[PDB]
C-alpha cells in the first residue's frame, strides 16, 4: 500500500470527522461498527482508515504505521509525543481536562491522592502549582474513584459535567482546554506531501 493511512478512534472521533472527510472526498465504504475488521477502504483509492483505541493513535502515527491521524490533545499531552507534527486544531470532540473531588468535601491536609488515567498530566499540573501528589493509574470510570476512597481528587475530561454530577462530584481546577488535532508522521509529511496537502486544505476550509 503506497497511499495514505489515516488513524481514527471508533466512537466519537469517527463520527465527528465524517463531515470533514466527506468534504475532502474520503467517505467510508462500510460502517466499522457492523464489522470486526479494523482496516477499511474509502471513496478515495489512495486513503484508507485504521480504527484504533484513542490512546493508540499517536503511537501508530509516531512510528509510521499510519501516515496521519486524529487524536485528542489530552491523549497527546499524556503521550508526550515530540515525534509527530500537530498541524491543525480540528475544533471537534471539544472538552476540558480538569480536577474534580466529592461535592462539598474539603481537601485532606496532607499529600493528595490523585486517581487518573492521565498520569503525566496530573503530575505536571500539580507540580506547576508547586505541589506534590501521589497518583494511582486507572483506565476509566474515574468519577467513581473519590466515592470509594481511591483518591481525593481525579483528573479527567469533562464536557457537560453530567458524569461528574451523576456520580456526586464537582469540578475544581481547570487544567487546559482539549480538542482533537490532526497529527502527521514526520517522514510521511516529507514523502507524501503531495497526497496530504489537498486533504489538509479541505480540513482547513471545513473548520474556518
Amino acid at each position: 500500500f503506497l497511499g495514505l493511512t489515516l488513524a481514527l478512534s471508533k466512537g466519537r472521533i469517527l463520527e465527528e470527522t465524517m463531515p470533514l472527510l466527506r468534504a475532502a472526498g474520503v467517505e467510508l465504504l462500510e460502517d466499522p461498527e457492523a464489522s470486526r475488521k479494523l482496516i477499511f477502504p474509502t471513496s478515495n483509492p489512495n486513503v484508507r482508515v485504521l480504527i484504533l483505541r484513542a490512546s493508540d493513535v499517536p503511537t501508530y502515527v509516531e512510528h509510521g504505521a499510519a501516515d496521519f491521524g486524529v487524536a485528542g490533545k489530552d491523549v497527546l499531552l499524556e503521550h508526550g509525543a515530540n515525534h509527530v507534527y500537530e498541524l491543525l486544531d480540528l475544533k471537534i470532540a471539544q472538552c476540558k481536562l480538569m480536577t474534580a473531588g466529592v461535592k462539598d468535601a474539603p481537601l485532606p491536609n496532607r499529600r493528595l491522592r490523585i486517581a487518573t488515567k492521565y498520569v503525566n498530566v496530573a503530575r505536571a499540573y500539580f507540580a506547576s502549582q508547586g505541589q506534590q501528589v501521589d497518583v494511582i493509574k486507572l483506565y476509566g470510570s474515574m468519577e467513581l474513584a473519590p466515592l470509594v476512597g481511591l483518591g481525593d481528587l481525579i483528573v479527567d475530561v469533562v464536557d457537560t459535567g453530567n458524569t461528574l454530577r451523576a456520580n456526586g462530584l464537582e469540578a475544581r481546577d481547570h487544567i487546559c482546554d482539549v480538542s482533537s488535532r490532526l497529527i502527521v508522521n514526520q517522514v510521511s509529511y516529507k514523502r507524501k506531501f503531495a497526497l496530504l496537502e489537498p486533504i489538509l486544505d479541505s480540513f482547513k476550509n471545513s473548520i474556518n
Binding site: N82, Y85, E86, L87, Y189, K204
Partner: peptide
C-alpha cells in the same frame, strides 16, 4: 510552532 510546522 516550528517543530509542528504550524504555518497558519
Amino acid at each position: 510552532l516550528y517543530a509542528n510546522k504550524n504555518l497558519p
